A paper describes a structure:
[name] has sequence similarities to the catalytic domains of glutamine amidotransferases, while [name] is similar in sequence to the substrate-binding domains of Mur ligases. Together, these two proteins catalyze the amidation of α-D-isoglutamic acid of cell wall precursor stem peptides in an ATP-dependent reaction. In order to provide insight into the overall organization of this complex and to facilitate an understanding of the amidation mechanism, we have determined the crystal structure of the [name]/[name] complex. We find that the two proteins assemble into a curved, boomerang-shaped structure, with [name] docking to the C-terminal domain of [name].
The native structure of the [name]/[name] complex was solved at a resolution of 2.04 Å using single isomorphous replacement with anomalous scattering (SIRAS). The refined structure has excellent statistics and includes all residues of the expressed proteins with the exception of [name] residues 1–35, 195–196 and 434–437. These regions are poorly visible in the electron density maps and therefore likely have multiple conformations and increased mobility. The [name]/[name] heterodimer adopts a boomerang-shaped conformation, with [name] packing against the C-terminal domain of [name]. Extensive interactions between [name] and [name] establish a large, continuous interface that buries a total surface area of 940 Å2 from solvent (calculated with PISA28). Instead, [name]-H189 is shifted towards the heterodimer interface, where it contacts an aspartic acid (D349) of [name], thus establishing a possible alternative catalytic triad ([name]-C94, [name]-H189, [name]-D349) involving residues from both [name] and [name]. The close proximity of the side chains of [name]-C94 and [name]-H189 (3.7 Å) and [name]-His189 and [name]-D349 (3.1 Å) as well as their relative orientation suggest that these three residues might indeed function as a proton relay system in catalysis. The crystal structure of [name] bound to [name] establishes an initial framework for probing the function of this enzyme complex and for developing strategies to intervene with amidation. The two proteins assemble into an elongated complex, with a large open space separating [name] from the middle domain of [name]. The refined model retains the overall characteristics of the crystal structure, but it has a more compact conformation with a closest distance between [name] and the [name] middle domain, measured at the top of the structure, of 22 Å instead of 32 Å. These experiments show that, while the conformation of the unliganded [name]/[name] complex is indeed open and elongated as observed in the crystal structure, the complex can breathe somewhat in solution. The almost linear arrangement between the two [name] domains appears to be unique to [name] as all other known conformations of this two-domain segment are more closed in Mur ligases.
Author numbering:
A (entry chain B): 38 to 134, 140 to 194, 197 to 433
B (entry chain A): 1 to 246
Write the structure that this text describes.
C-alpha cells in the first residue's frame, strides 16, 4: 500500500519497457535529466521487477524529486500497475528470442483506458499493437534507408487480422515499414531518425538535428531515439537533450569514453583476433594523433596461449597517426615483439603494471585508445576512472 | 633481389594462428638480411615438385584436418622424403610433426596412418602435457614456449634439445621435438618462431647455403625476442623453486 502513496507524490512517472534496450534508454533519460539538475527517482537493471521498483521509490523519494524514471521488466507490468499509474510509458521493442503475441495482449489489457501517454516504436509491429490501449499515442521510428543494418528472416502475422504482414522495407528482422490490407501499418512518426552512422560513436540525425554521441552500437540508435522521445514529451528542448546526449557514456569498458578538458580516452575490451581487429580500427576513425595502451594478461580466464595475437592485424597500425604504444599485462613483452614483427615503427613502452601503464597515457595529448583483454579490463578501467576524476 | 621460396602446405584449415606467426617471423628475419621471402600455399599436391622449394612448412590442424592433409600429402610422399634426405629445411608443428611418422593412436585406440617419412609413432592420452616449456639446445640456444598436447611421440632421432622445464615429446624423456637433418618438428605454441630467432635463422641460413646466396649480417638485434623469452624463463624458475620448497 505504500508504493501508491509514494508514487502519488510524483507528478511525472516514466516507465521504460520492452525486451531490449531498457537500460540504455533509461540511463539516457536519467542522465539527461540529472545533467539539468532535475531531481529524479531512478532504478537500475538489477531492480526492474516489482520488489526492486518498490525499493527504489522508498530509498530515493524526497520532497524535491518530481520525476521517476523506471525501467520495468515486461512481465512485471501487471503486478506493478495495480499500484502505480505512469504518466507515460515508452516501449522499445518485443523480440521472441506465438509467445510475443500473448504477452503483448496481456500488457495491452493492463494499461488500457488509464490515460497513460504511450510512446511506441512505429517500426516494431508488436510494440505498435499497443495503440489499442490508449487514446494518447506518440510514435517514434526510423526512416527507410536511414542505415544499412547487419541483416538476418521469416514471415510474421498481423496482430490485428491474422494475415501475413506485408513489409515495404525492413530495417532488420521484424523491424521495418509494414502495412496490412486491414489498415494496421507502420504509422507516421513524430520523432524520426532520418540517418545515422557509427564512426566510431553514434552520430544521429533526429528531426533535422545532429546528435554527436559517446556510445556505440547500431542497436543503440533506437534506444537513443526512445530516450529522446521521452525527453521531448517531458518538454525538454532539442539543445537541452543535445547537451545530455553528448556526454552520456557506457560504464562496462565496451566503447566507453572519457574526457577531462582536452584529454580524451576510450576503452574497448579485446580478447581474440576479431575483437582486436575491431578495436584497432576504432583508432583510425578518430581524428588526430592517438596513444595506445594495450594489455595482454595470460591468467586462467584469458587462456595461457597468446598465439592468437599473430592472427590479429597489428600491421594496420602503421596507417594511423600514433604518438606511442604502451604495452602492459603479464605478457606485455609478447606484444612488444608482435609489434616489432608487425613493423609498427613508433615508440613502444613496456610497463607490465596495468595501473602504471594506463596512468601513463595521461601524459600524451593524443586520443588514448585503451585495449585490454579480459582480466586486464578491471584494473585498466579502474585506473581510467581514477585518472579522469 | 635475393629470394627464398617457402612451401606452405595445407594452409586450408579452420585456424592457422601458429602458421601465420611462423611465416611472419621468417619473412622478417630474412628481410633484415636483405632477403625477400616468397610464400607458395600448396593445397593441391598432384604433380608438385620440390625444385622451387627452399624451406617447407606443415602446421597442425584438427584430427580430421590432419587426416585429410595426410592423405593429400601422401600423393608426394616420395619426393618429400627425398627432399628431406637431401637436406631440405622444413618446419612442422604438432599434427604436421606427428604425422611424419608411421602412426598416430588416439586416446580411444583408433590408429591413424601418417606419411611414414620417419619410423616413429605417437600415442595420445586424455591427460595432456600442458604448461610453459624451456629447452636448452646446442644448435638453437634457449627455446621457450607453451605446450598443450595429448600426444606422446616416441622416436629415436635427434631432438630440439633437453627440456629443463616442462615435458616435450612425452612424459619421460625430457626432450622436445625432432631435428633430423634440416627437418624440424615441435609441439611448441607461441607460435614457436617469433621468440626463438635461432630456429628461424637456422632454417633461413641452411636455405641460403643450399642455394648459394649470402646470409648477412649474421648478427642482428634480438632484444625484443630476448625480453619475451625472459618472461617465461623467469616464471619457469619461480615455478621450480616452489616445488623444491614443497
Ligand atoms: Mg551499421
Ligand atoms: Zn492486418
Amino acid at each position: 500500500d505504500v508504493l501508491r502513496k509514494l508514487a502519488e507524490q510524483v507528478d511525472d512517472i516514466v516507465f521504460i519497457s520492452g525486451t531490449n534496450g531498457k537500460t540504455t534508454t533509461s540511463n539516457l533519460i536519467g542522465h539527461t535529466l540529472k545533467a539539468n539538475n532535475i531531481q529524479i527517482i531512478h532504478n537500475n537493471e538489477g531492480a526492474n521487477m516489482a520488489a526492486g521498483i518498490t525499493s527504489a521509490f522508498i530509498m530515493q523519494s524526497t520532497p524535491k524529486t518530481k520525476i521517476a524514471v523506471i525501467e520495468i521488466d515486461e512481465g512485471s507490468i501487471p503486478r506493478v500497475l495495480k499500484e502505480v499509474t505512469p504518466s507515460m510509458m515508452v516501449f522499445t521493442n518485443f523480440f521472441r528470442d506465438g509467445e510475443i503475441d500473448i504477452m503483448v495482449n496481456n500488457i495491452a489489457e493492463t494499461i488500457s483506458n488509464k490515460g497513460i501517454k504511450l510512446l511506441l516504436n512505429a517500426d516494431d509491429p508488436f510494440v505498435s499493437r499497443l495503440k489499442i490501449a490508449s487514446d494518447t499515442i506518440v510514435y517514434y521510428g526510423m526512416k527507410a534507408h536511414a542505415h544499412e543494418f547487419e541483416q538476418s528472416n521469416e514471415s510474421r502475422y498481423c496482430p490485428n487480422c491474422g494475415r501475413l504482414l506485408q513489409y515495404d522495407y525492413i530495417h532488420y528482422n521484424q523491424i521495418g515499414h509494414y502495412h496490412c490490407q486491414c489498415g494496421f501499418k507502420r504509422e507516421q512518426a513524430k520523432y524520426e531518425i532520418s540517418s545515422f552512422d557509427v564512426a566510431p560513436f553514434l552520430y544521429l540525425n533526429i528531426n533535422d538535428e545532429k546528435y554527436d554521441m559517446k556510445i556505440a552500437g547500431d542497436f543503440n540508435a533506437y534506444n537513443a531515439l526512445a530516450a529522446y522521445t521521452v525527453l521531448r514529451e517531458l518538454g525538454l528542448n532539442e539543445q537541452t537533450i543535445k547537451n545530455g546526449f553528448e556526454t552520456y557514456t557506457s560504464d562496462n569498458g565496451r566503447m566507453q569514453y572519457f574526457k577531462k578538458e582536452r584529454k580524451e580516452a576510450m576503452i574497448n575490451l579485446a580478447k581474440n583476433p576479431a575483437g582486436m581487429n575491431a578495436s584497432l580500427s576504432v583508432g583510425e576513425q578518430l581524428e588526430g594523433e592517438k596513444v595506445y595502451v594495450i594489455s595482454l594478461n595470460d591468467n586462467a580466464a584469458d587462456g595461457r596461449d597468446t598465439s592468437w595475437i599473430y592472427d590479429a592485424d597489428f600491421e594496420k597500425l602503421s596507417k594511423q597517426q600514433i604518438e606511442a604504444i604502451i604495452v602492459t599485462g603479464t605478457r606485455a613483452e609478447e606484444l612488444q615483439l608482435r609489434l616489432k614483427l608487425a613493423e609498427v615503427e613508433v615508440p613502444i613502452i613496456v610497463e607490465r603494471d596495468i595501473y602504471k601503464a594506463t596512468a601513463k597515457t595521461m601524459d600524451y595529448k593524443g586520443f588514448t585508445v585503451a585495449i585490454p583483454n579480459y582480466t586486464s579490463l578491471a584494473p585498466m578501467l579502474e585506473q581510467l576512472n581514477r585518472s579522469f576524476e | 633481389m635475393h629470394e627464398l621460396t617457402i612451401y606452405h602446405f595445407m594452409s586450408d584449415k579452420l585456424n592457422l594462428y601458429s602458421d601465420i606467426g611462423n611465416i611472419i617471423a621468417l619473412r622478417q628475419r630474412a628481410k633484415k638480411r636483405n632477403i625477400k621471402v616468397n610464400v607458395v600455399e600448396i593445397n593441391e599436391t598432384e604433380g608438385i615438385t620440390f625444385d622451387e622449394c627452399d624451406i617447407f612448412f606443415i602446421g597442425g590442424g584438427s584430427d580430421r584436418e590432419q587426416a585429410l592433409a595426410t592423405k593429400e600429402l601422401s600423393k608426394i610422399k616420395t619426393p618429400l622424403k627425398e627432399a628431406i634426405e637431401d637436406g631440405m629445411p622444413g618446419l612442422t608443428i604438432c599434427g604436421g610433426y606427428q604425422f611424419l611418422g608411421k602412426k598416430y593412436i588416439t586416446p580411444d585406440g583408433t590408429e591413424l596412418e601418417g606419411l611414414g617419412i620417419l619410423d616413429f609413432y605417437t600415442e595420445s592420452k586424455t591427460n595432456r602435457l600442458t604448461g610453459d616449456i624451456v629447452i636448452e639446445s646446442d644448435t638453437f640456444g634457449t627455446i621457450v614456449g607453451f605446450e598443450n598436447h595429448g600426444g606422446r611421440t616416441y622416436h629415436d632421432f635427434g631432438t630440439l634439445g633437453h627440456v629443463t622445464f616442462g615435458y616435450g615429446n612425452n612424459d619421460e624423456d625430457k626432450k622436445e621435438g625432432i631435428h633430423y637433418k634440416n627437418l624440424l618438428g615441435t609441439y611448441l605454441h607461441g607460435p614457436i618462431l617469433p621468440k626463438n630467432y635461432e630456429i628461424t635463422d637456422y632454417l633461413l641460413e641452411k636455405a641460403c647455403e643450399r642455394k648459394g646466396i649470402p646470409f648477412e649480417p649474421k648478427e642482428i638485434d634480438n632484444e625484443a625476442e630476448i625480453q619475451a623469452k625472459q618472461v617465461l624463463i623467469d616464471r619457469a624458475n619461480r615455478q621450480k623453486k616452489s616445488r623444491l620448497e614443497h
